[PDB]
Design an enzyme around this catalytic site. Structure first.
Site, PDB file in Angstrom:
ATOM      1  N   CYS A 422       0.896  -1.184   0.000  1.00  0.00           N
ATOM      2  CA  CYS A 422       0.000   0.000   0.000  1.00  0.00           C
ATOM      3  C   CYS A 422       0.942   1.245   0.000  1.00  0.00           C
ATOM      4  O   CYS A 422       1.859   1.291  -0.816  1.00  0.00           O
ATOM      5  CB  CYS A 422      -1.008   0.011   1.160  1.00  0.00           C
ATOM      6  SG  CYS A 422      -0.281  -0.244   2.806  1.00  0.00           S
ATOM      7  N   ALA A 424       2.608   2.954   3.258  1.00  0.00           N
ATOM      8  CA  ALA A 424       3.688   2.648   4.220  1.00  0.00           C
ATOM      9  C   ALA A 424       3.973   1.117   4.306  1.00  0.00           C
ATOM     10  O   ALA A 424       5.058   0.683   4.671  1.00  0.00           O
ATOM     11  CB  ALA A 424       3.367   3.233   5.598  1.00  0.00           C
ATOM     12  N   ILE A 426       2.029  -1.160   6.060  1.00  0.00           N
ATOM     13  CA  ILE A 426       1.772  -1.678   7.412  1.00  0.00           C
ATOM     14  C   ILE A 426       0.271  -1.829   7.710  1.00  0.00           C
ATOM     15  O   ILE A 426      -0.090  -2.836   8.278  1.00  0.00           O
ATOM     16  CB  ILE A 426       2.544  -0.876   8.525  1.00  0.00           C
ATOM     17  CG1 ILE A 426       2.124   0.633   8.569  1.00  0.00           C
ATOM     18  CG2 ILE A 426       4.066  -1.021   8.333  1.00  0.00           C
ATOM     19  CD1 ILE A 426       2.889   1.602   9.504  1.00  0.00           C
TER      20      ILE A 426
END
Ligand SMILES: COc1cccc(-c2nnc3n(Cc4ccc(C(=O)N5CCC[C@H]5C(=O)O)cc4Cl)c(=O)c4ccccc4n23)c1O
Length: 488
Positions: A422, A424, A426
């Site tokens: 995506c 970052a 996370i």
């Protein structure tokens, strides 16, 4: 520790806590009451309290006047170690003394309202030697252990705001008491040692009964209480991120302070003969593998392809649009349809793009330049419909996508890990990987298997920081697994 986080306090209670029980440099963190989903960092600075906003829409924790982080424990550890970084007008705020919480609500062993019979039932079915719990008694508490085999109940007295087991020391919190008897176990007259080894498991459910748990967690919420207990376990996951800190790797990270763990990072061996071995990416091993990574930077596109080729990855899951909210989330690392492009020593062709309702599939062909025999197909599954903020209102679209990704990976013999990204790498990434891991348990083992959602998340979180960012994603993971079993 993570005692500086107080789940059930107001801004007023926080102000009075710091001004009466703390000093200049004292701080605490708390969930926001004004806007749920958010957090506040309350700091005492020259006899006055400052309240700082921390935001999480699902990608990272965004502290006003500070930086973006993977976890609250990572944020706190950073500002306590690196001073002069947090600013107001531009006044340098210093985090010096965590103001500790005495509230046992987010602890794994706290059960509150619970009977001695029901505590005995849970310890009989779900417990082993050393399994324990702490529950409410008339304002007093009860410590119930399992030793084998038997259950021993120890009264915890609450006298003038302190806790004791009927003699010896008087503790300022149940946690201080619990910790003390974890290190110094109570011995019974006839020699039985009351070993406090592990808290009793309250999260493992049978897959077929997820609907019953969803209903129970939807009652005043239970999802919030369960999530904040998982959040509390994140102080155990502060592993080194030294390699990601190197001067040479600074521009290789999309967010300055969201770094990959050194023990799980994907090390690149291609190597142009100085520091050609870094990518903000980590290997995810369940208990089928994954690589959890950030969206490409124009300067990391080449490293991205060196990684895909090295790891033998044949499937890419992109869970963002290239641009969301006028901000660049991931650069376009693939060629236009039918085009051929060279990304360093790597060569890619976009053979064909197929547009479904929730996503686009791009058939890519990857090979090393000067070696035609190295060619392999890389299937890029690009989810386009995820909301800019929050989670989809229905998990069917995500489940259908994940089903196709699964079957594609399954059909390819000796395919390496599935690349998932995506912005970052996370939040949405962690969400897709966790949904995929749990739904793989129910694939092989069927509806009769045991599933433990926060156990899975914690395991994935020891492999890459902040995997699964919000309580909304966590609820989405429950909602997704529940829909899979319902359609089974
Ligand atoms: C077993 O435990 C471990 C063993 C060994 C290392 C670590 C470890 N790994 N990361 C971090 N961080 C995060 C961090 C650190 C620096 C920078 C950074 O850019 N640098 C470098 C140039 C200027 C400076 C700066 O920004 O001031 C950015 C981040 Cl996010 C911390 O804070 C940190 C604080 C106390 C202890 C370990 C820390 N630790 C560790 O956890």
């Amino acid at each position: 520790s993570r005692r500086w986080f107080h789940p059930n306090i107001t801004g007023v209670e926080a102000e009075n806590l710091l001004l009466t029980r703390g000093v200049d440099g004292s701080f605490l963190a708390r969930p926001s009451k004004s806007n749920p989903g958010d957090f506040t960092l309350s700091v005492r600075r020259n006899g006055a309290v400052t309240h700082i906003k921390i935001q999480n829409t699902g990608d990272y924790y965004d502290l006003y006047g500070g930086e973006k982080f993977a976890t609250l424990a990572e944020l706190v550890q950073y500002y306590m170690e690196h001073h002069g970084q947090l600013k107001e007008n531009g006044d340098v705020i210093e985090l010096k003394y965590p103001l500790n919480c005495a509230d046992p609500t987010s602890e794994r062993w706290f059960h509150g309202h619970l009977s001695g019979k029901e505590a005995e039932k849970l310890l009989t079915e779900k417990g082993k030697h050393g399994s324990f719990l702490v529950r409410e008694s008339p304002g007093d508490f009860v410590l119930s252990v399992r030793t084998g085999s038997k259950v021993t109940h120890v009264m915890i007295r609450c006298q003038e705001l302190k806790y004791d087991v009927g003699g010896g020391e008087r503790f300022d919190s149940l946690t201080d008491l619990v910790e003390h008897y974890k290190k110094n176990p109570m011995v019974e007259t006839l020699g039985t040692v009351l070993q406090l080894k592990q808290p009793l498991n309250t999260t493992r459910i049978n897959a077929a009964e997820i609907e019953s748990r969803v209903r129970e967690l939807s009652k005043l919420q239970g999802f919030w209480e369960e999530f904040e207990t998982l959040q509390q376990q994140e102080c155990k996951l502060l592993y080194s991120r030294k390699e990601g800190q190197r001067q040479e790797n600074k521009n290789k990270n999309r967010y300055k302070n969201i770094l990959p763990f050194d023990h799980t990072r994907v090390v690149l061996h291609d190597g142009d003969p100085p520091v050609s071995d870094y990518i903000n990416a980590n290997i995810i091993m369940p208990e089928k593998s994954y690589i959890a990574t950030q969206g490409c930077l124009q300067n990391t596109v080449n490293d991205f392809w060196r990684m895909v080729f090295q790891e033998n990855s044949r499937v890419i899951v992109m869970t963002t649009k290239e641009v969301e909210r006028g901000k660049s989330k991931c650069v376009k690392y693939w060629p236009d349809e039918y085009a051929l492009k060279e990304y360093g020593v790597m060569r890619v062709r976009n053979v064909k793009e197929s547009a479904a309702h929730d996503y686009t599939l791009r058939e890519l062909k990857l090979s090393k330049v000067g070696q035609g025999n190295t060619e392999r197909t890389v299937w890029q599954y690009h989810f386009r419909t995820w909301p800019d903020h929050g989670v989809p209102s229905d998990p069917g679209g995500v489940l259908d996508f994940l089903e196709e990704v699964h079957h594609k990976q399954e059909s390819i013999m000796d395919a390496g890990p599935v690349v998932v990204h995506c912005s970052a790498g996370i939040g949405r990434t962690g969400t897709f990987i966790v949904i995929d891991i749990l739904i793989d348990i129910i694939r092989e083992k069927g509806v009769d298997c045991d599933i433990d959602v926060p156990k899975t998340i914690q395991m994935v979180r020891s492999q890459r920081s902040g995997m699964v960012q919000t309580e909304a994603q966590y609820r989405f993971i429950y909602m997704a697994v529940q829909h899979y079993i319902e359609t089974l």
